Amino acid sequence: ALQYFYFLRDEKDSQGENMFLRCVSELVIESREFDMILGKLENDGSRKPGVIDKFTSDTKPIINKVASVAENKGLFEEAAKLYDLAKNADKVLELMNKLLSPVVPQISAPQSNKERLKNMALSIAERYRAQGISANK
């Protein structure tokens, strides 16, 4: 879909350009294919580019838009993912603390040693904290 939308620019001029941008924006929203479209995992090394990024530019504003929406829906994980791309490190940890915090209180029998919110917790800490950590103490 991205490849096709990109053709829209082929008609060079404003209007069409915005139409292209809106179309991409519309694609990201509601398709919710964030990783594919927007990018993924830092391991330092900024984003690993999404397909759109290869095309480039307005990508930060789209992320904020998507992320806020995620907040409405309460699609946590998506929000965390989105904020990572946003590079709002402090925001990420805070949302993150909330996610891990609940699920901690509850009743027992869980927590395999390999994947979920806890695992997510481990990822971020190892990941951010060593590196020039921008988050609040």
Place this chain on the structure above:
Amino acid sequence: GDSSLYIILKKLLDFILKTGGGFQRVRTHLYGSLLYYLQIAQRPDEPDTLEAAKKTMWERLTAPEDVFSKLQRENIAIIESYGAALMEVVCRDACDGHEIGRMLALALLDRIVSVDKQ
């Protein structure tokens, strides 16, 4: 928090279902209290508020607030039980008696209505 109010809400539902009260006059009072309670719980907020809360839950990035949704869920459970019983009572009642008490019961039915819409 109108938690203390919640208990009265329960008592009200209890009495209505029981349909004790020779007086529809009594039931009109019950309907009125229930109406205010239902209205009070959701201060005028519209779909935007709900969407924002969901996003925040989004997911518990950190510590979320999901207080109003939780309150609505508790109200709706209570109401359900009592509900089937009471719906019967509330509608029949409707008609008659009380063209008066009516103003009170129809309003109660409509508020209730949003919530528990669905």
